Amino acid sequence: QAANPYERGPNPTESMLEARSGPFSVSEERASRFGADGFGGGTIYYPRENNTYGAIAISPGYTGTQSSIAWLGERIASHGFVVIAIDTNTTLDQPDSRARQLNAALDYMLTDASSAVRNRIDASRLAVMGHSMGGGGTLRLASQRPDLKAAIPLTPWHLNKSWRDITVPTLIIGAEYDTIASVTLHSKPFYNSIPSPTDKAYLELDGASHFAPNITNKTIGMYSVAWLKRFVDEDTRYTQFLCPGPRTSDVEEYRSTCPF
Ligand SMILES: [Ca+2]
Numbered sequence: 443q444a445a446n447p448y449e450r451g452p453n454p455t456e457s458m459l460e461a462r463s464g465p466f467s468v469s470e471e472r473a474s475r476f477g478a479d480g481f482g483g484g485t486i487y488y489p490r491e492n493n494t495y496g497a498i499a500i501s502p503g504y505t506g507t508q509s510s511i512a513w514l515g516e517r518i519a520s521h522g523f524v525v526i527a528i529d530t531n532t533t534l535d536q537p538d539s540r541a542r543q544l545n546a547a548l549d550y551m552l553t554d555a556s557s558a559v560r561n562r563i564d565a566s567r568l569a570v571m572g573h574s575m576g577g578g579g580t581l582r583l584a585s586q587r588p589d590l591k592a593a594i595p596l597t598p599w600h601l602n603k604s605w606r607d608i609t610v611p612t613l614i615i616g617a618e619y620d621t622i623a624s625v626t627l628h629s630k631p632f633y634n635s636i637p638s639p640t641d642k643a644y645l646e647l648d649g650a651s652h653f654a655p656n657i658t659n660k661t662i663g664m665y666s667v668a669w670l671k672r673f674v675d676e677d678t679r680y681t682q683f684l685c686p687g688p689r690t691s692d693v694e695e696y697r698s699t700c701p702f
Pocket residue numbers: 618648649694
Protein backbone atom coordinates (compact mmCIF):
# COMPACT_ATOMS: atom_id res chain seq x y z
CA GLN A 443 0.00 0.00 0.00
CA ALA A 444 1.89 3.10 -1.20
CA ALA A 445 2.19 5.54 -4.09
CA ASN A 446 2.46 3.46 -7.24
CA PRO A 447 6.27 3.12 -7.81
CA TYR A 448 5.79 3.13 -11.63
CA GLU A 449 3.81 6.41 -11.70
CA ARG A 450 5.37 8.95 -14.05
CA GLY A 451 4.19 12.48 -15.08
CA PRO A 452 1.31 14.68 -13.97
CA ASN A 453 -2.33 13.74 -13.31
CA PRO A 454 -3.58 13.23 -16.87
CA THR A 455 -6.31 15.09 -18.72
CA GLU A 456 -7.88 14.40 -22.10
CA SER A 457 -6.15 17.41 -23.51
CA MET A 458 -2.72 16.27 -22.30
CA LEU A 459 -3.31 12.86 -24.02
CA GLU A 460 -4.56 14.38 -27.25
CA ALA A 461 -1.62 16.74 -27.58
CA ARG A 462 1.30 16.06 -29.96
CA SER A 463 3.68 15.32 -27.01
CA GLY A 464 3.57 14.23 -23.45
CA PRO A 465 5.44 15.85 -20.50
CA PHE A 466 8.88 14.12 -21.07
CA SER A 467 11.36 15.49 -23.61
CA VAL A 468 12.75 12.52 -25.54
CA SER A 469 16.04 11.57 -27.14
CA GLU A 470 16.73 8.92 -29.88
CA GLU A 471 19.23 6.20 -30.33
CA ARG A 472 19.59 4.12 -33.45
CA ALA A 473 19.37 0.33 -33.35
CA SER A 474 21.58 -0.17 -36.40
CA ARG A 475 20.61 -2.66 -39.05
CA PHE A 476 24.30 -3.55 -38.79
CA GLY A 477 24.03 -4.24 -35.05
CA ALA A 478 20.59 -5.80 -34.55
CA ASP A 479 20.33 -9.61 -34.38
CA GLY A 480 16.91 -10.98 -35.34
CA PHE A 481 15.32 -7.87 -36.72
CA GLY A 482 16.05 -5.01 -39.10
CA GLY A 483 17.12 -2.32 -36.63
CA GLY A 484 15.15 0.69 -35.52
CA THR A 485 14.97 3.88 -33.52
CA ILE A 486 14.75 3.84 -29.74
CA TYR A 487 12.91 6.87 -28.29
CA TYR A 488 13.54 7.43 -24.57
CA PRO A 489 12.80 10.04 -21.93
CA ARG A 490 15.78 12.27 -21.18
CA GLU A 491 14.83 12.12 -17.50
CA ASN A 492 16.87 9.45 -15.77
CA ASN A 493 14.23 7.14 -14.19
CA THR A 494 13.05 3.62 -15.02
CA TYR A 495 10.16 3.19 -17.43
CA GLY A 496 8.27 0.48 -19.23
CA ALA A 497 9.75 -0.67 -22.62
CA ILE A 498 7.68 -1.06 -25.69
CA ALA A 499 8.44 -2.54 -29.17
CA ILE A 500 6.44 -1.41 -32.16
CA SER A 501 6.38 -3.24 -35.61
CA PRO A 502 5.21 -1.59 -38.93
CA GLY A 503 3.21 -3.58 -41.48
CA TYR A 504 3.84 -5.24 -44.87
CA THR A 505 6.02 -3.03 -47.12
CA GLY A 506 6.32 -0.62 -44.14
CA THR A 507 9.31 0.74 -42.31
CA GLN A 508 10.12 2.30 -38.94
CA SER A 509 9.18 5.67 -40.38
CA SER A 510 5.51 4.73 -40.77
CA ILE A 511 5.21 4.19 -37.00
CA ALA A 512 7.84 6.68 -35.71
CA TRP A 513 5.38 9.33 -34.74
CA LEU A 514 3.63 6.90 -32.42
CA GLY A 515 6.87 5.62 -30.85
CA GLU A 516 7.97 9.13 -30.20
CA ARG A 517 4.54 10.27 -28.83
CA ILE A 518 4.46 7.30 -26.49
CA ALA A 519 8.12 7.74 -25.22
CA SER A 520 7.19 11.33 -24.45
CA HIS A 521 4.63 10.11 -21.84
CA GLY A 522 7.46 8.21 -20.03
CA PHE A 523 8.24 5.08 -22.02
CA VAL A 524 11.29 3.62 -23.74
CA VAL A 525 10.02 2.69 -27.11
CA ILE A 526 11.62 1.10 -30.20
CA ALA A 527 10.05 1.56 -33.61
CA ILE A 528 11.54 -1.22 -35.72
CA ASP A 529 12.39 -2.07 -39.24
CA THR A 530 11.83 -5.72 -40.10
CA ASN A 531 14.49 -7.99 -41.66
CA THR A 532 12.63 -7.52 -44.98
CA THR A 533 9.60 -5.39 -45.62
CA LEU A 534 7.74 -8.51 -46.82
CA ASP A 535 8.00 -10.48 -43.58
CA GLN A 536 4.74 -12.13 -42.44
CA PRO A 537 2.96 -11.71 -39.00
CA ASP A 538 4.64 -14.55 -37.21
CA SER A 539 8.06 -13.51 -38.36
CA ARG A 540 7.21 -10.03 -37.10
CA ALA A 541 6.29 -11.67 -33.70
CA ARG A 542 9.87 -13.09 -33.51
CA GLN A 543 11.31 -9.73 -34.47
CA LEU A 544 9.21 -7.75 -31.87
CA ASN A 545 10.78 -10.37 -29.42
CA ALA A 546 14.36 -9.74 -30.71
CA ALA A 547 13.71 -5.98 -30.38
CA LEU A 548 12.73 -6.18 -26.72
CA ASP A 549 15.88 -8.30 -26.09
CA TYR A 550 17.85 -5.65 -27.92
CA MET A 551 16.61 -2.79 -25.75
CA LEU A 552 17.35 -4.87 -22.72
CA THR A 553 20.81 -6.24 -23.56
CA ASP A 554 22.28 -4.52 -26.58
CA ALA A 555 21.35 -0.84 -26.47
CA SER A 556 23.59 1.80 -24.82
CA SER A 557 23.77 2.27 -21.06
CA ALA A 558 21.59 5.33 -21.27
CA VAL A 559 18.79 3.15 -22.75
CA ARG A 560 19.24 0.09 -20.67
CA ASN A 561 19.37 2.24 -17.50
CA ARG A 562 15.98 3.66 -18.20
CA ILE A 563 14.26 0.34 -18.68
CA ASP A 564 12.41 -1.62 -15.99
CA ALA A 565 13.13 -4.97 -17.75
CA SER A 566 10.05 -6.54 -16.17
CA ARG A 567 7.48 -4.22 -17.61
CA LEU A 568 7.37 -4.75 -21.42
CA ALA A 569 4.73 -4.33 -24.08
CA VAL A 570 4.33 -4.71 -27.90
CA MET A 571 2.33 -2.98 -30.53
CA GLY A 572 2.12 -3.40 -34.22
CA HIS A 573 0.40 -2.06 -37.38
CA SER A 574 -1.46 -4.52 -39.59
CA MET A 575 0.86 -7.52 -40.08
CA GLY A 576 2.91 -5.96 -37.16
CA GLY A 577 -0.45 -6.10 -35.40
CA GLY A 578 -0.82 -9.86 -36.23
CA GLY A 579 2.80 -10.23 -34.90
CA THR A 580 1.74 -8.48 -31.62
CA LEU A 581 -1.18 -10.94 -31.11
CA ARG A 582 1.21 -13.88 -31.77
CA LEU A 583 3.85 -12.56 -29.41
CA ALA A 584 1.25 -11.75 -26.85
CA SER A 585 0.02 -15.32 -27.15
CA GLN A 586 3.60 -16.70 -26.67
CA ARG A 587 4.60 -14.33 -23.85
CA PRO A 588 2.01 -14.20 -21.02
CA ASP A 589 4.68 -12.15 -19.13
CA LEU A 590 4.20 -9.03 -21.28
CA LYS A 591 2.12 -6.33 -19.64
CA ALA A 592 0.10 -5.17 -22.67
CA ALA A 593 -0.31 -5.67 -26.39
CA ILE A 594 -1.84 -3.11 -28.79
CA PRO A 595 -2.53 -4.47 -32.37
CA LEU A 596 -3.46 -1.52 -34.59
CA THR A 597 -5.61 -2.42 -37.59
CA PRO A 598 -4.19 -5.92 -37.33
CA TRP A 599 -3.94 -8.53 -40.05
CA HIS A 600 -3.40 -12.24 -39.53
CA LEU A 601 -4.58 -15.40 -41.10
CA ASN A 602 -5.03 -17.11 -37.76
CA LYS A 603 -8.31 -15.83 -36.23
CA SER A 604 -8.20 -17.67 -32.90
CA TRP A 605 -6.20 -16.03 -30.06
CA ARG A 606 -7.77 -18.11 -27.32
CA ASP A 607 -4.61 -18.34 -25.18
CA ILE A 608 -3.85 -14.64 -24.92
CA THR A 609 -3.82 -13.51 -21.26
CA VAL A 610 -2.03 -10.11 -21.77
CA PRO A 611 -4.28 -6.89 -21.57
CA THR A 612 -4.94 -6.26 -25.31
CA LEU A 613 -6.41 -3.25 -26.99
CA ILE A 614 -7.16 -3.81 -30.61
CA ILE A 615 -7.76 -0.71 -32.55
CA GLY A 616 -9.74 -1.09 -35.75
CA ALA A 617 -10.44 1.30 -38.54
CA GLU A 618 -14.05 1.55 -39.70
CA TYR A 619 -13.16 2.13 -43.45
CA ASP A 620 -10.18 -0.07 -43.62
CA THR A 621 -9.97 -1.67 -46.99
CA ILE A 622 -6.98 -3.86 -46.33
CA ALA A 623 -7.38 -5.47 -42.92
CA SER A 624 -11.18 -5.29 -42.60
CA VAL A 625 -12.43 -5.36 -38.96
CA THR A 626 -14.97 -8.00 -40.03
CA LEU A 627 -12.26 -10.49 -41.08
CA HIS A 628 -9.39 -9.39 -38.81
CA SER A 629 -9.78 -7.11 -35.70
CA LYS A 630 -13.24 -8.35 -34.58
CA PRO A 631 -12.63 -12.07 -35.05
CA PHE A 632 -9.28 -11.62 -33.08
CA TYR A 633 -10.98 -9.70 -30.31
CA ASN A 634 -14.02 -12.09 -30.17
CA SER A 635 -11.67 -14.98 -29.71
CA ILE A 636 -9.94 -13.69 -26.51
CA PRO A 637 -11.80 -15.32 -23.52
CA SER A 638 -12.52 -14.13 -19.95
CA PRO A 639 -10.82 -13.26 -17.76
CA THR A 640 -8.27 -11.54 -20.13
CA ASP A 641 -8.57 -7.72 -20.00
CA LYS A 642 -9.09 -6.36 -23.39
CA ALA A 643 -10.82 -3.66 -25.34
CA TYR A 644 -11.71 -3.06 -28.98
CA LEU A 645 -11.87 0.48 -30.26
CA GLU A 646 -12.85 1.16 -33.88
CA LEU A 647 -11.89 4.58 -35.17
CA ASP A 648 -14.81 6.23 -36.93
CA GLY A 649 -14.23 7.21 -40.61
CA ALA A 650 -10.61 5.90 -40.54
CA SER A 651 -8.59 4.05 -43.27
CA HIS A 652 -6.06 1.24 -42.76
CA PHE A 653 -3.33 3.91 -42.71
CA ALA A 654 -4.70 5.96 -39.85
CA PRO A 655 -2.02 4.41 -37.63
CA ASN A 656 0.75 5.88 -39.87
CA ILE A 657 -0.33 9.44 -39.43
CA THR A 658 -0.43 11.42 -36.23
CA ASN A 659 -3.83 10.63 -34.71
CA LYS A 660 -4.95 11.97 -31.29
CA THR A 661 -7.39 8.99 -30.72
CA ILE A 662 -4.67 6.34 -31.37
CA GLY A 663 -2.22 8.44 -29.26
CA MET A 664 -4.59 9.09 -26.36
CA TYR A 665 -5.88 5.48 -26.15
CA SER A 666 -2.51 3.74 -26.78
CA VAL A 667 -0.83 5.81 -23.97
CA ALA A 668 -3.89 5.31 -21.59
CA TRP A 669 -3.66 1.59 -22.25
CA LEU A 670 0.12 1.41 -21.67
CA LYS A 671 -0.17 3.67 -18.62
CA ARG A 672 -3.00 1.52 -17.11
CA PHE A 673 -1.19 -1.82 -17.77
CA VAL A 674 2.56 -1.36 -18.17
CA ASP A 675 2.69 1.16 -15.24
CA GLU A 676 -0.35 -0.17 -13.31
CA ASP A 677 -1.27 3.52 -13.33
CA THR A 678 -4.92 3.72 -12.31
CA ARG A 679 -5.09 7.49 -12.94
CA TYR A 680 -5.60 6.37 -16.59
CA THR A 681 -8.55 4.11 -16.03
CA GLN A 682 -10.92 7.09 -16.20
CA PHE A 683 -10.20 7.40 -19.99
CA LEU A 684 -10.68 3.75 -20.72
CA CYS A 685 -13.75 3.18 -18.45
CA PRO A 686 -16.54 3.53 -19.43
CA GLY A 687 -14.47 4.78 -22.39
CA PRO A 688 -15.41 6.70 -25.49
CA ARG A 689 -19.06 7.38 -26.33
CA THR A 690 -19.94 5.75 -29.69
CA SER A 691 -18.13 10.64 -31.76
CA ASP A 692 -14.56 9.79 -33.00
CA VAL A 693 -15.26 6.18 -32.19
CA GLU A 694 -17.33 3.78 -34.21
CA GLU A 695 -17.43 1.11 -31.47
CA TYR A 696 -15.86 0.44 -28.05
CA ARG A 697 -16.02 -2.78 -26.17
CA SER A 698 -14.03 -3.51 -23.02
CA THR A 699 -13.67 -5.55 -19.92
CA CYS A 700 -13.80 -2.36 -17.75
CA PRO A 701 -13.02 -1.78 -15.01
CA PHE A 702 -10.29 -4.47 -15.50
CA1 LIG B 1 -19.33 5.55 -38.40
